[PDB]
């Protein structure tokens, strides 16, 4: 069983997973909507009481299972809890990252396609509409947003061909394994990623128009209202953001950690990776989108831009903004090339869990594990590419509800069923530094309490709407992803039989 070649490689790979489009798109929007600078108070608390502890736990559960030749939760859950039901709950550790990869690699391909377009100068060229319109029409023609009643997407041939190229790039990295593939790429992509971010931050900071300056936007995202704190919605928003940004509950971290040597440090290493992500989010991420947008639209509208959604901000607003500044074309290319590496380092992280299962449990060669996974993903993605709101449906069940539920699940199994003391000693073993003793109570009582509340709130507020309001096409996806869970349950069955 392969291991991470170096300490740095491990950290850069883990950090690579956490760092994502959310650092540059979702955070600025969430921060601006939930109290600006005041949002940092719940954000930091959530990072301490939910973010870090759960990360250490996943890291530990991964390294624990790896020592016995297991990198996926169906097996690992069974180790921590010898019970038939534990293996089924573990199937989610395969289902979640798989379903997410089905629509995420496609979303990822978009950024590449835009990057290719901006690079070739094939991008489109008064009021805020005649400037945004050419780009909205560009995006909708790309991903094939329906101009008719039918719930059918009509992706451009270019969009489709780019998805194949993106799938290929992913396979090229994964098929080389952990150290010679994921790790080797991580050591290159991460520095590259931070260089593009910093460069953009600087270039954006030098933006000025009669309507506002980039510094204005910075003096808005960080000017604390301190009145939203009373609103419990902000605390829920903060815990959510923290949970999403650290990529917790995907089972991806567990799989990555399973390649860590049995008593190699995970406390300091995990803390480092998490810090890299928080720097790329609050410092780098929260200094490109909003500031650049505010620079042109003005301090005024600041709310609207954030409210307009995290997606419209990155794929419509900014590109149009760039096409207005000098040399903004090359500037927009750097933006999407940044978002592409951001996604590329994460897509390989969520496709690995499936690969690991095939290797460890079904004893497939890396080549066969990677290709078969690639096939399952590529095929399944056609449902997301051609069926409207399919992406949204998957993102909710797996990428939203699923991740939180699974997060609370793995925490209860490891710290309650497995044993609080045993779990604590497992986490700290080999640690360059020891986990603060206070965290023993946090992990055992606090962390699970926050997650339970986040689930109860998101459930009572989201599920009834999804079940009733949504179009009937929604079932074609539900049917398919339910089938995927049944499929994985069958593979786990065959694994135990062999």
């Amino acid at each position, epitope marked *: 069983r392969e291991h991470w070649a170096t300490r740095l490689g491990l950290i850069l790979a883990m950090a690579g997973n956490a760092v994502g489009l959310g650092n540059f798109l979702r955070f600025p929007v969430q921060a601006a909507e939930n109290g600006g600078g005041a949002f940092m108070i719940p954000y930091i608390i959530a990072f301490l009481l939910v973010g870090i502890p759960l990360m250490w736990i996943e890291w530990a559960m991964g390294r624990y299972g790896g020592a016995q030749g297991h990198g996926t939760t169906p097996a690992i859950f069974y180790l921590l809890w010898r019970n038939r039901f534990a293996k089924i709950l573990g199937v989610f550790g395969l289902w979640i990252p798989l379903v997410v990869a089905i629509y995420f690699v496609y979303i990822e391909s978009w950024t590449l396609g835009f990057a290719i377009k901006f690079l070739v100068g094939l991008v489109p060229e008064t009021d805020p509409d005649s400037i945004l319109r050419p780009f909205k029409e560009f995006l909708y023609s790309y991903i094939g947003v329906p101009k008719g009643d039918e719930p059918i997407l009509k992706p451009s041939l270019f969009a489709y061909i780019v998805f194949l190229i993106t799938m290929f790039i992913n396979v090229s990295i994964l098929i080389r394994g952990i150290s010679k593939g994921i790790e080797r790429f991580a050591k290159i992509a991460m520095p590259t990623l931070f260089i593009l971010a910093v460069f953009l931050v600087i270039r954006v900071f030098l933006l000025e128009t009669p309507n506002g300056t980039a510094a204005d936007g910075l003096n808005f995202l960080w000017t604390p209202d301190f009145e939203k704190l009373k609103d419990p919605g902000v605390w829920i928003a903060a815990v959510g953001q923290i949970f999403f940004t650290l990529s917790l509950g995907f089972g991806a971290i567990i799989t990555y950690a399973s390649y860590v040597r049995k*008593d190699q440090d995970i406390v300091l290493s995990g803390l480092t990776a998490a810090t890299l992500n928080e720097a790329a989010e609050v410092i780098l991420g929260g200094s490109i989108s909003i500031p650049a947008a505010v620079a042109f639209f003005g301090v005024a509208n600041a709310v609207a831009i954030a409210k307009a959604g995290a997606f419209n901000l990155g794929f419509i607003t900014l590109p149009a903004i760039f096409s207005q500044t000098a040399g903004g074309t090359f500037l927009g290319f750097l933006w999407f090339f940044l978002l592409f590496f951001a996604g590329l380092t994460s897509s390989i992280a969520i496709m690995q869990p499936m690969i690991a299962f095939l290797e460890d449990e079904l004893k497939l060669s890396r080549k066969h594990a990677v290709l078969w996974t690639a096939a399952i993903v590529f095929f399944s993605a056609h449902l997301v590419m051609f069926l409207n709101k399919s992406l949204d449906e998957m993102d909710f069940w797996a990428g939203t509800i699923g991740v939180v539920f699974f997060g609370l699940t793995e925490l209860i199994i490891f710290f309650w069923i497995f044993g609080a003391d045993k779990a604590w000693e497992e986490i700290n*073993r080999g640690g360059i530094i020891k986990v603060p003793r206070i965290y023993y109570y946090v992990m055992r009582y606090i962390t699970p309490a926050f997650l339970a509340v986040l689930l109860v709130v998101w459930a009572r507020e989201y599920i009834p709407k999804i079940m009733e309001e949504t179009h009937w096409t929604v079932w074609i996806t539900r049917f398919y992803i339910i089938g995927l869970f049944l499929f994985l349950t069958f593979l786990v069955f065959l694994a135990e039989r062999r």
Partner: antibody
Framework: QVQLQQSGAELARPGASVKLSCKAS????????INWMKQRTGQGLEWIGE????????YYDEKFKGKATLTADKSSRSAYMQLSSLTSEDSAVYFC??????????????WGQGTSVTVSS | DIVLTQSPASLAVSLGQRATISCKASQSVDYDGDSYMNWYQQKPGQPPKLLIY???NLESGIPARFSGSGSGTDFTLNIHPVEEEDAATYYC?????????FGGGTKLEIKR
């Protein structure tokens, strides 16, 4: 004053079972592993396996698993090893040792005086 | 298993001279900058004693006469100058992967 003390001079008839002990002190028992060594008179050292008392997990050399059984009581800072279905070839000296977990230095820095097991009728 | 082969099996050196044991591993014992090769000294009747860890690191309490070197698969134990009390068997040991393995051991004879 890191010290590992072992039971001594155990004698047992062929087929019977024996259980060596290893009382540790002078350090945090949970932060380290305790492993076992077999050394026959006039021969080299054999690694039997190890255990992390802090969690309880055990590791064996495929040769010895079934023959040896590693346990440990975290409370008494003590570690045990049971040898089953004893043979004349189980007659040897058995060392328990503390293996460091800090990196990069996984080594045994403290040993017990060793236990001489004799299997005869 | 990573088999360790020591050489020579037996060695005789004078009270002023240098003693050199070598340990050849079947495969690399290195990992992320560190070399997990260890050296032990065993006098008759008592347990082994940690001389060198990490291939080149002198264990606290051990005389500077003992030094370690090498990496990958090649390692050598150096005792200089040799003393009457250096009479013992020496083992090399790898901690790279389970199971842990020892070298055949080299009996050091002090020439008088």
């Amino acid at each position: 004053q890191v010290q590992l003390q072992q039971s001594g001079a155990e004698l047992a008839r062929p087929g019977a079972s024996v259980k060596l002990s290893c009382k540790a002190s002078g350090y945090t028992f949970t932060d380290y592993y305790i492993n076992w060594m077999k050394q026959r008179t006039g021969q080299g050292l054999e690694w039997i396996g190890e255990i992390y008392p802090g969690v309880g997990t055990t590791y064996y050399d495929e040769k010895f698993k079934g023959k040896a059984t590693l346990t440990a009581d975290k409370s008494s800072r003590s570690a045990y090893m049971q040898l089953s279905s004893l043979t004349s070839e189980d007659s040897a000296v058995y060392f328990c040792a503390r293996r460091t977990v800090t990196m990069g230095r996984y080594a045994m820095d403290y040993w017990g005086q060793g236990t001489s097991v004799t299997v005869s009728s | 298993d990573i088999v360790l082969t020591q050489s020579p099996a037996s060695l005789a050196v004078s009270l002023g001279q240098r003693a050199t044991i070598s340990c050849k591993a079947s495969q690399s014992v290195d990992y992320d900058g560190d070399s997990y090769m260890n050296w032990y000294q065993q006098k008759p009747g008592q347990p082994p004693k940690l001389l060198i860890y990490g291939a080149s690191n002198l264990e606290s309490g051990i005389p500077a006469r003992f030094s370690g070197s090498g990496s990958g698969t090649d390692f050598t134990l150096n005792i200089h100058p040799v003393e009457e009390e250096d009479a013992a068997t020496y083992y090399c040991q790898q901690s790279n992967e389970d199971p842990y393995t020892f070298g055949g051991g080299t009996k050091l004879e002090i020439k008088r």
